[PDB]
Amino acid sequence: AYAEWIAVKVVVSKSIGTVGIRNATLQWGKFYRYTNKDDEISTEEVSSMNVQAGSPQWIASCGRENASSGTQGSFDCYDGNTKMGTFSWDDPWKSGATNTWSFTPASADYAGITSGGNATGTDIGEVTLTLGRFSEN
């Protein structure tokens, strides 16, 4: 249902400048143009986004309308040709089931720190993903 949704705000550090969103996939649900759940967009459109430092953009997904199912999927973040990592989520419809999400970095050269999100209830809601380039201290 539309009650199951996530919207990921992609924040790119000047340590990277531009992040390519690629390889988006869904096991359940659809992508949409935040904030209008009726405005469905293709996986290819999501997988063509370039996010610039200073101007965050949103990747949003919800369950299919009136269905007893939610949204589950992922997308990859790239710094040019170099994979930074993968953001994944699982927002089930079933009442009482835990909602989950994570960024998994490809290496210690990049980090994706998340803030926000509901582990319980219908929707994950808005989550911020802050991406940067890092070196060991």
Numbering used by the authors: 2 to 138
From the paper:
Recombinant RahU protein was expressed using E. coli expression system, purified and subjected to crystallization trials. It is of note that RahU was purified in 20 mM Tris buffer and formed crystals in 0.2 M di-Sodium tartrate, 20% (w/v) PEG 3350. The crystal structure of the apo-RahU was determined at 1.27 Å resolution. The structure shows that RahU is a single domain protein with a distinct β-sandwich architecture that is typical for bacterial and fungal aegerolysins. Furthermore, RahU β-sandwich structure shows structural homology to the superfamily of actinoporins, 20-kDa pore-forming proteins found in sea anemones, with a RMSD value of 2.2 Å when compared to equinatoxin II31 or stycholysin II32. Some of these residues, such as Val20, Ile22, Ile60, Thr72, Phe76, Phe88, Trp90, Asn100 and Trp102, are positioned in the mainly hydrophobic core to maintain the integrity of β-sandwich architecture. However, a majority of the conserved non-alanine and non-glycine residues, including Trp6, Ser16, Asn24, Trp29, Lys31, Lys38, Asp39, Glu41, Ser43, Arg65, Asp77, Asp80, Asp91, Pro93, Trp94, Thr99, Thr101, Ser116, Asn119 and Thr129, is solvent-exposed and/or positioned in the loop areas, possibly providing a uniform environment to aid in the membrane lipid recognition step.
Members of the aegerolysin protein family are acidic proteins of 13–20 kDa, which are mainly found in bacteria and fungi. In this work, we show for the first time that the bacterial aegerolysin RahU from P. aeruginosa interacts specifically with CPE. The crystal structures of RahU revealed the conserved aegerolysin fold as well as a ligand binding cavity, harbouring a Tris molecule from the crystallization solution. The structures of RahU, in the absence and presence of Tris were determined at 1.27 Å and 1.13 Å resolution, respectively, and reveal a typical aegerolysin fold with a central β-sandwich flanked by a loop containing a short α-helix.
